[PDB]
Amino acid sequence: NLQEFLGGLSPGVLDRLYGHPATCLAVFRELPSLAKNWVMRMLFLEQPLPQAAVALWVKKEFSKAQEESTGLLSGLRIWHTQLLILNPIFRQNLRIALLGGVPSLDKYAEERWEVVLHFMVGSPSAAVSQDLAQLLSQAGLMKSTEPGEPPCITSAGFQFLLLDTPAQLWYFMLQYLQTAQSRGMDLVEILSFLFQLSFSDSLLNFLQHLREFGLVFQRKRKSRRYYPTRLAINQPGFIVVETNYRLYAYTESELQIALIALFSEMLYRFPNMVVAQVTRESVQQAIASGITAQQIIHFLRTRAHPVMLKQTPVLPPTITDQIRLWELERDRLRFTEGVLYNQFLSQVDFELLLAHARELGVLVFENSAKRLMVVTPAGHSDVKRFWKRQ
Amino acid sequence: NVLKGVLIECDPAMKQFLLYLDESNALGKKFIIQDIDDTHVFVIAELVNVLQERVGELMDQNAFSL
Amino acid sequence: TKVDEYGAKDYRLQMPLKDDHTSRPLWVAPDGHIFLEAFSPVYKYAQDFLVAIAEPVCRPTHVHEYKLTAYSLYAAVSVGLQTSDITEYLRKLSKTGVPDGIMQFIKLCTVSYGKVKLVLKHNRYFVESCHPDVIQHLLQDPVIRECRLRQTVSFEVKQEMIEELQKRCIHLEYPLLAEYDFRNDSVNPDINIDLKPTAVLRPYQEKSLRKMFGNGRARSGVIVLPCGAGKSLVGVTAACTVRKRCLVLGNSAVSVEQWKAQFKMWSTIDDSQICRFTSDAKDKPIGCSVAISTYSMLGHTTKRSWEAERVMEWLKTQEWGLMILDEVHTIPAKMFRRVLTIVQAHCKLGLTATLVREDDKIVDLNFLIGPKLYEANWMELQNNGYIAKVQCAEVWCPMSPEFYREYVAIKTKKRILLYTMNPNKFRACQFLIKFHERRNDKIIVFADNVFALKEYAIRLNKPYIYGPTSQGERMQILQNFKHNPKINTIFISKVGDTSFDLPEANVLIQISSHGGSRRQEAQRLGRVLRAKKGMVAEEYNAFFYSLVSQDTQEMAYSTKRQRFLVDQGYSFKVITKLAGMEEEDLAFSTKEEQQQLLQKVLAAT
Amino acid sequence: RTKRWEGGYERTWEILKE
């Protein structure tokens, strides 16, 4: 989440990131329940106050909210104990932020993201962009290994594919920022724009990438002014599931059919409908590719036709249970690298080695009755050094 | 002593199947280095892939092709 | 014909889409498959029309699946639906048009009907036809001349070769008409049989009878109805409506006894007018008309008693207005199918509850008797309460380690006796029976292996029944099961699924299975479908457990065995583990007991 | 005295027209 992203930052980048226009407001909205009120209270104070007052300003009931809010905002470093006055820069910026100082767009975003997903899957016809391709390759969800041949899709790619559009896009932008630092693009400057959306060379390139993702559209031959789409700020289902592992999806966009074919066998394709079967072959194929049953169940549930919404649960229990059992059977045999021991002359030495391995975390499994254990190769060197040291 | 390889844990039925494999030399070698527990055994790392393929064939036998 | 990048065939360039597709709830694939919506407001009308012209293959709760063929189209024409009368409404209902292939198929199938009619008179089968050109171009193959005994043109045909000629015409594109004009028939006087007002006909029963009697002439066909649905009542009603001599054919002694009882209960016909052509008991078959016999009775190939010869010759000589055949799924058998040609009947109605088999001989029934007239909707009956709702379940029993070791080690087929008898399934069935026994639920255990059945029955000291069991002891055990509160479970062998009149049971456990037999699965499931006096559909009072052993061939057989049930719509829920099994004390709780059972299994040989 | 079945098929869909 954005709270995780901002929590994973240094004070020096934090205060700089707290830009005057929007950041002080976007991070404010993040404040779940009580920190908002406390911020407004100590927004006009130039004198720090004791911590005991903050501690006792919440009734005995629901004190966990006070503790969690204080910890979260301590992580954000909005104030300092100074002994709890807010940061002067944040105070000034927030005061400046508080009385101081479309239908075609959504379709464009939908279409652009759909073509991006078409390229993500092995679609023969898709939008071509070398920068987009390499960006997705370095995002960790794609690997090419051969520039001449089109890149394939890694295991993480399928999991990303089956995610819902909001979470999918948000994770994609998270990876964008992390890779922006690696490529050398300043993180603060690009980050502030996202906050400003919900209300330089690097900026132009970043906006080009956003427009490629479909979040924004200049509409005036790449002019300075931009009109963000709905996805920039941050639908009914169509699949019908039977009790015989049969899916009838009212899909006209090829993307949905490809997503369903990733874990089902297609039988018929009507102009406004498609028939698929969820068989062992398809489900285990997806599980081998890397998906897990949770994504498939979630995907079918979210794209659930209104007809089956009346029944509770929406997805039939037999279908859900069969999918889960099919995924479990694949990982019945759990493989774990390790090194076995044999010929323990005395159990005292074996127990001492077991205690050492437990302390270091090297041990993976132990058998007192048989006087043996298994250690990962990483800890094999450590235990070998211990044995040599005697 | 110290023995290289991998440890595999599975249900007792699969463990018994692995014991049948090693005893009958289905793969041509006694890959089972030792039996850690009723649900855990040790096999050589190099043979894990082919053993897993054999288990997949067993699942094909015990599942109907819908 | 066109295949997309995926498995599904492509029809983007095949047929168009109606603008008011949302209004139209019907689909039409070029192969003949049709997908109806069970949520549309006009679902009932679409259901009636699609049932009239097509036969169901899958009817889940949401989207039903029908496929039409030549026999179904012939049945529609028999109930009087012309090519336009069906195709016009099909196009109106269809939300994506009608492909030209289906259009031409419908036209050809409808036009190629009624040209050739088969009528038996004075023990002679004449192939009548108003159009003469049909016969003129039908006598090309020499089989017709050799078969024939050595406007409105008709010619007599040999009795024995009727089946061969019928199957030949089916692929010759000139189906024969077996309609019986019982209304206009003076050769055979009508029998004094009437339907008493006491008998009550359910709406689906009336619909099936109407489809059979699409017009004043009765149609010969197969009506598939659940055993608990009153197929016996439907057959009795059909005979009463025909009002001519009727020959009901059972499959066993219990079947003939039940058929006689049904006749007396629901028909005013006197007792003396009904006979049982059975060797154990003869009731003067020649004396009266309405007769009940069995397939082995008629088709017997070896020696015959002198009295049974006299009866058989009388049956062959006489002509029957109706030939009811219960359990038609066994008809395509060699001896059983010989009976069709042995006896003469105008219309041979067929009743059954499990019209499924592995060998592709079920298709032969279409010409042996006729097209599948009606096939009741099990889910709709469940909703209407005519049939008890069943919570179909498959309890997965993990196989014990040693048992799996021997099972996998041996490549022979002792596994049938091995995986059917494992400690985990034994404990599972014991716990399940205990749970239902304290719940006052009647249990009917099933097992193909008599050896395993006996072992389980002795260990649980329960009254197991099987083939060579004495009839008196069988009846005593059944009576105790029905009446004695102290006993609420019976362990029946395969004989149970063949034919019986057993009391309604709240649960049905199946520890073992004969194999991938949809027939056996449906047959055994039909036992608990008996609706209770005041139950409800949603209460799921009836339960069915098909215990299976994990990682064993039994799983393959179970999955291949539940196909027909899932096609009807029943959802088999999987149960990996049972709550309370660990706390409850059960046999084989120690390794030694499993070892003794394994040693006995090995010594079984 | 004939039965309702001999009369003919119900034709339940014929009621609906478009």
Side-chain angles (χ1 to χ4, degrees):
Chain A
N1 200 322
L2 175 60
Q3 57 173 48
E4 189 201 351
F5 187 62
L6 294 189
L9 291 176
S10 71
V13 67
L14 274 164
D15 53 14
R16 273 100 56 88
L17 173 54
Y18 292 173
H20 54 291
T23 300
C24 63
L25 176 60
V27 183
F28 179 76
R29 302 279 179 66
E30 176 181 353
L31 306 173
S33 284
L34 294 174
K36 295 189 291 300
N37 290 103
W38 263 261
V39 162
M40 276 78 78
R41 303 171 61 192
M42 62 193 67
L43 185 55
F44 294 75
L45 277 287
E46 293 291 339
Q47 198 272 329
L49 58 84
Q51 289 72 245
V54 165
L56 62 84
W57 272 344
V58 166
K59 285 194 184 296
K60 65 210 85 165
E61 197 68 30
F62 315 114
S63 295
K64 313 312 302 195
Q66 174 63 101
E67 263 79 5
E68 56 85 17
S69 70
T70 313
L72 172 54
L73 278 77
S74 81
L76 301 170
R77 297 167 145 287
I78 293 164
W79 61 82
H80 316 306
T81 182
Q82 203 182 8
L83 194 75
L84 294 160
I85 200 171
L86 312 187
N87 300 17
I89 184 61
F90 185 80
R91 166 182 275 90
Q92 193 198 355
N93 279 13
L94 173 51
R95 198 193 312 283
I96 297 303
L98 192 151
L99 179 39
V102 167
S104 170
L105 271 77
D106 53 67
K107 301 306 307 313
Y108 156 85
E110 199 177 9
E111 208 289 328
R112 182 64 60 85
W113 201 230
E114 272 198 51
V115 293
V116 167
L117 297 162
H118 288 117
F119 157 76
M120 178 60 204
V121 302
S123 187
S125 181
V128 302
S129 182
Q130 66 92 29
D131 55 358
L132 184 65
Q134 58 85 34
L135 174 62
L136 290 157
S137 176
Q138 75 193 346
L141 54 78
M142 268 176 81
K143 81 188 183 296
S144 86
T145 71
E146 42 182 359
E149 199 72 27
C152 57
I153 296 89
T154 66
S155 296
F158 293 106
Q159 304 191 17
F160 161 91
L161 275 161
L162 299 190
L163 296 197
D164 302 334
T165 316
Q168 189 176 220
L169 192 81
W170 153 247
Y171 161 82
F172 180 59
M173 290 173 69
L174 182 138
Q175 287 297 100
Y176 180 97
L177 296 172
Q178 269 186 12
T179 46
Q181 190 61 42
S182 297
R183 69 181 94 167
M185 289 291 106
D186 50 354
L187 190 146
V188 180
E189 183 59 27
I190 68 185
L191 180 59
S192 197
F193 187 94
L194 309 173
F195 295 160
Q196 189 269 327
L197 277 182
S198 180
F199 297 112
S200 68
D201 190 299
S202 177
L203 284 163
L204 291 156
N205 199 7
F206 170 82
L207 187 67
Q208 194 265 317
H209 282 177
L210 271 294
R211 183 255 296 165
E212 208 160 9
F213 304 154
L215 310 196
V216 295
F217 182 34
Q218 285 85 343
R219 197 163 267 181
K220 201 158 83 72
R221 301 282 81 74
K222 312 298 104 174
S223 66
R224 195 261 294 165
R225 173 60 184 165
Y226 50 84
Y227 288 107
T229 70
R230 264 291 303 287
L231 279 68
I233 297 89
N234 306 115
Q235 61 90 41
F238 50 85
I239 309 191
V240 172
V241 188
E242 302 299 347
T243 62
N244 56 2
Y245 317 111
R246 198 75 73 79
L247 313 170
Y248 302 80
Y250 307 78
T251 54
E252 296 86 350
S253 63
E254 207 274 333
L255 173 62
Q256 298 297 345
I257 295 89
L259 293 182
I260 283 163
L262 284 168
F263 66 99
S264 79
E265 296 193 350
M266 281 180 56
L267 301 191
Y268 308 89
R269 185 161 174 194
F270 306 126
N272 65 359
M273 199 262 278
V274 67
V275 186
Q277 198 190 3
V278 184
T279 62
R280 290 177 63 259
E281 310 173 7
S282 88
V283 161
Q284 273 206 335
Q285 195 189 7
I287 294 286
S289 75
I291 298 146
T292 176
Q294 176 41 245
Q295 290 100 23
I296 292 160
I297 292 156
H298 190 60
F299 171 89
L300 297 168
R301 173 56 183 84
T302 182
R303 289 157 176 82
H305 202 264
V307 65
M308 60 191 300
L309 291 180
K310 285 83 170 171
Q311 56 179 85
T312 183
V314 174
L315 267 290
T318 305
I319 312 307
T320 60
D321 298 7
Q322 193 64 248
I323 296 164
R324 292 211 179 77
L325 211 57
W326 284 346
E327 74 162 1
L328 288 166
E329 204 285 343
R330 197 73 271 175
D331 55 48
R332 281 275 264 289
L333 274 60
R334 290 192 71 248
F335 292 69
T336 49
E337 292 179 353
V339 188
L340 182 61
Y341 302 154
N342 305 302
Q343 303 184 338
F344 284 151
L345 76 168
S346 70
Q347 50 262 25
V348 179
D349 301 329
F350 152 69
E351 293 148 26
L352 290 162
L353 193 149
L354 179 60
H356 184 62
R358 291 160 161 201
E359 185 174 0
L360 293 171
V362 161
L363 181 82
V364 175
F365 181 84
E366 176 267 335
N367 195 348
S368 55
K370 299 187 95 77
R371 282 179 286 287
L372 56 86
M373 62 173 87
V374 60
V375 298
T376 184
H380 172 246
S381 76
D382 306 339
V383 66
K384 189 71 167 184
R385 195 199 71 259
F386 155 77
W387 186 55
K388 296 287 100 175
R389 287 190 293 91
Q390 286 292 285
Chain B
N1 310 139
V2 68
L3 267 289
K4 300 288 95 175
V6 185
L7 189 148
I8 53 180
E9 63 182 344
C10 53
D11 53 358
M14 287 290 160
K15 187 249 191 170
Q16 296 283 334
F17 171 53
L18 302 182
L19 289 170
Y20 161 62
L21 282 168
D22 70 16
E23 194 68 30
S24 65
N25 301 284
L27 291 170
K29 295 170 79 173
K30 271 85 177 188
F31 55 89
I32 289 284
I33 295 98
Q34 180 157 345
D35 180 18
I36 296 89
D37 201 355
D38 56 1
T39 55
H40 302 63
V41 296
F42 206 71
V43 302
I44 56 176
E46 53 257 31
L47 211 72
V48 302
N49 300 315
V50 62
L51 188 151
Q52 179 55 289
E53 196 260 324
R54 295 280 287 182
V55 167
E57 206 176 275
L58 181 137
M59 191 192 188
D60 302 337
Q61 299 185 358
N62 302 316
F64 175 62
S65 58
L66 285 159
Chain C
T1 184
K2 183 66 170 61
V3 174
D4 271 321
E5 58 265 21
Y6 309 117
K9 307 167 277 288
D10 192 73
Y11 303 135
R12 313 289 61 69
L13 60 89
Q14 211 288 334
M15 79 291 278
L17 178 68
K18 300 287 180 63
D19 292 334
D20 61 351
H21 55 269
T22 181
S23 59
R24 274 75 174 287
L26 191 142
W27 276 289
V28 184
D31 72 347
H33 282 231
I34 289 156
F35 306 81
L36 177 64
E37 304 177 1
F39 53 86
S40 45
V42 307
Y43 155 68
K44 173 53 175 179
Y45 298 162
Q47 187 196 3
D48 171 40
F49 168 63
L50 281 174
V51 163
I53 61 170
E55 63 96 13
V57 176
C58 280
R59 284 189 271 88
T61 186
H62 292 118
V63 168
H64 296 323
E65 207 284 339
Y66 296 76
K67 68 183 290 294
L68 58 90
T69 48
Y71 317 109
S72 81
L73 292 160
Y74 302 155
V77 176
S78 297
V79 292
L81 298 152
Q82 294 82 21
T83 182
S84 46
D85 216 329
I86 62 187
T87 311
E88 184 271 328
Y89 208 75
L90 177 63
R91 187 260 299 163
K92 185 188 288 185
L93 268 169
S94 169
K95 82 181 78 203
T96 193
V98 183
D100 185 56
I102 296 293
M103 187 85 200
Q104 62 182 120
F105 182 77
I106 287 161
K107 285 272 171 188
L108 181 134
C109 284
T110 296
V111 300
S112 65
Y113 183 86
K115 308 297 182 290
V116 190
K117 187 184 284 177
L118 175 138
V119 60
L120 81 171
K121 178 170 72 173
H122 311 144
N123 307 120
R124 279 170 288 159
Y125 289 73
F126 311 113
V127 170
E128 181 266 320
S129 61
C130 200
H131 315 281
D133 61 341
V134 65
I135 307 307
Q136 296 302 320
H137 82 80
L138 180 136
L139 273 75
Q140 304 300 310
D141 47 345
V143 66
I144 303 300
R145 274 86 73 197
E146 61 85 24
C147 169
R148 195 244 177 285
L149 194 82
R150 298 285 279 96
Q151 73 306 332
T152 77
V153 68
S154 69
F155 48 95
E156 202 269 333
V157 190
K158 204 184 287 185
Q159 178 79 72
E160 76 196 63
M161 298 297 289
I162 287 160
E163 185 193 355
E164 192 78 44
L165 181 135
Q166 214 156 1
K167 59 156 69 65
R168 179 144 198 80
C169 295
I170 292 278
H171 80 75
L172 188 151
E173 315 305 319
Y174 270 106
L176 268 51
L177 264 59
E179 296 167 273
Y180 181 26
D181 204 334
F182 74 101
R183 296 296 306 285
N184 274 313
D185 186 3
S186 61
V187 173
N188 188 7
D190 61 345
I191 55 162
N192 195 358
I193 185 165
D194 292 331
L195 183 68
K196 56 165 68 63
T198 313
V200 64
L201 196 66
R202 279 145 156 161
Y204 65 95
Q205 297 174 325
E206 160 164 332
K207 192 67 165 57
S208 74
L209 279 158
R210 192 191 303 280
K211 192 152 180 60
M212 181 192 170
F213 299 98
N215 299 123
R217 312 181 289 178
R219 285 91 172 83
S220 80
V222 176
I223 281 168
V224 177
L225 297 167
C227 64
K231 83 186 175 38
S232 66
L233 172 57
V234 179
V236 170
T237 300
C240 287
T241 313
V242 163
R243 292 295 309 281
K244 262 85 174 176
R245 309 172 75 77
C246 79
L247 179 69
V248 183
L249 277 75
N251 202 358
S252 56
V254 173
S255 180
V256 58
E257 295 298 332
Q258 290 168 204
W259 272 111
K260 191 190 159 121
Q262 292 288 323
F263 266 108
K264 294 192 290 188
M265 175 182 303
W266 309 110
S267 298
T268 60
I269 185 162
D270 57 281
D271 183 289
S272 63
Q273 201 65 249
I274 296 159
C275 52
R276 301 203 311 272
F277 178 35
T278 301
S279 179
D280 313 298
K282 298 291 180 68
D283 268 341
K284 307 288 284 186
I286 298 152
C288 71
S289 79
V290 175
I292 299 168
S293 197
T294 73
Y295 303 124
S296 178
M297 296 300 102
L298 281 52
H300 188 193
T301 58
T302 62
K303 64 212 161 293
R304 179 94 308 148
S305 296
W306 157 86
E307 190 276 331
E309 292 293 328
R310 301 300 99 191
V311 172
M312 184 180 286
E313 287 296 334
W314 175 73
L315 297 164
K316 289 162 167 272
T317 47
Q318 203 148 27
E319 308 173 1
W320 297 99
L322 183 69
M323 181 158 166
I324 291 149
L325 311 179
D326 70 344
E327 310 290 356
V328 288
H329 51 86
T330 52
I331 288 288
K334 281 173 71 62
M335 178 173 73
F336 297 168
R337 94 195 299 157
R338 291 284 181 288
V339 176
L340 297 157
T341 62
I342 278 159
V343 192
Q344 299 181 0
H346 291 255
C347 68
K348 52 181 77 69
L349 184 65
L351 287 83
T352 187
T354 78
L355 196 151
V356 290
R357 209 159 51 187
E358 278 57 15
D359 48 353
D360 288 314
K361 273 166 197 71
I362 288 293
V363 299
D364 289 341
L365 292 172
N366 287 296
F367 84 88
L368 285 172
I369 285 160
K372 291 163 211 178
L373 289 159
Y374 195 79
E375 307 194 10
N377 183 343
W378 289 40
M379 301 297 287
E380 201 157 4
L381 296 177
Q382 286 200 324
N383 294 126
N384 309 343
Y386 307 132
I387 284 162
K389 181 67 69 65
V390 174
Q391 179 66 235
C392 285
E394 187 189 348
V395 166
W396 286 36
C397 304
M399 179 160 263
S400 52
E402 44 259 23
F403 279 56
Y404 201 102
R405 179 174 186 72
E406 290 93 9
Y407 160 89
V408 71
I410 71 182
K411 280 214 170 188
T412 66
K413 283 281 160 61
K414 179 65 72 66
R415 50 188 74 169
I416 296 90
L417 188 152
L418 194 51
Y419 61 69
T420 285
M421 289 168 57
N422 62 1
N424 285 101
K425 196 192 294 195
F426 194 108
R427 292 154 66 80
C429 77
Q430 190 182 346
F431 170 79
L432 278 156
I433 294 154
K434 261 178 181 190
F435 183 83
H436 293 301
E437 274 202 327
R438 66 183 79 172
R439 213 159 160 287
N440 288 318
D441 286 314
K442 296 284 194 182
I443 306 99
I444 307 184
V445 178
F446 276 76
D448 164 37
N449 191 352
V450 64
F451 181 84
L453 180 63
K454 296 220 268 191
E455 288 215 5
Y456 275 48
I458 61 188
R459 292 180 160 287
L460 280 72
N461 67 21
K462 253 71 173 177
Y464 65 102
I465 293 158
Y466 56 112
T469 293
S470 61
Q471 211 288 337
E473 190 67 25
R474 183 178 298 170
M475 263 295 166
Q476 191 200 10
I477 291 158
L478 292 181
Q479 286 290 323
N480 300 9
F481 175 78
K482 186 191 279 176
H483 292 109
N484 176 17
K486 281 192 286 185
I487 209 158
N488 281 341
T489 186
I490 51 172
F491 285 42
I492 312 172
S493 187
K494 289 208 297 190
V495 64
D497 58 51
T498 55
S499 182
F500 273 117
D501 192 345
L502 299 189
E504 55 268 24
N506 285 19
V507 306
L508 195 159
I509 294 89
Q510 170 168 209
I511 63 175
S512 199
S513 60
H514 178 253
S517 69
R518 281 82 60 73
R519 182 193 66 72
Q520 194 182 60
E521 171 56 21
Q523 284 276 350
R524 293 176 173 172
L525 170 59
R527 303 290 176 193
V528 300
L529 298 184
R530 308 293 163 73
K532 307 295 185 288
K533 293 288 184 287
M535 63 166 288
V536 192
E538 54 261 24
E539 286 179 355
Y540 278 88
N541 62 355
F543 306 88
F544 180 102
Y545 304 73
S546 168
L547 276 47
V548 294
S549 53
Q550 308 194 23
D551 298 304
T552 42
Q553 195 70 24
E554 186 156 16
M555 301 307 304
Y557 287 144
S558 166
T559 51
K560 194 202 299 182
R561 167 181 274 264
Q562 295 165 6
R563 292 181 291 188
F564 176 40
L565 297 187
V566 296
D567 293 9
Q568 306 319 108
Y570 298 84
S571 71
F572 267 69
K573 176 180 177 302
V574 167
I575 297 158
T576 56
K577 61 96 176 179
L578 281 72
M581 204 177 74
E582 47 264 28
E583 60 193 359
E584 172 52 31
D585 191 300
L586 309 166
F588 304 95
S589 313
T590 59
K591 64 183 90 79
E592 48 260 33
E593 302 181 22
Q594 310 187 156
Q595 177 50 259
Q596 284 100 29
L597 190 150
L598 176 72
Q599 192 74 265
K600 178 146 62 172
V601 164
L602 263 65
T605 316
Chain D
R1 165 55 189 163
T2 65
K3 307 274 191 302
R4 59 202 155 287
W5 318 293
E6 305 303 331
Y9 200 66
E10 185 58 24
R11 296 280 190 81
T12 315
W13 68 86
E14 71 91 18
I15 296 89
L16 187 139
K17 315 184 153 76
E18 286 284 324

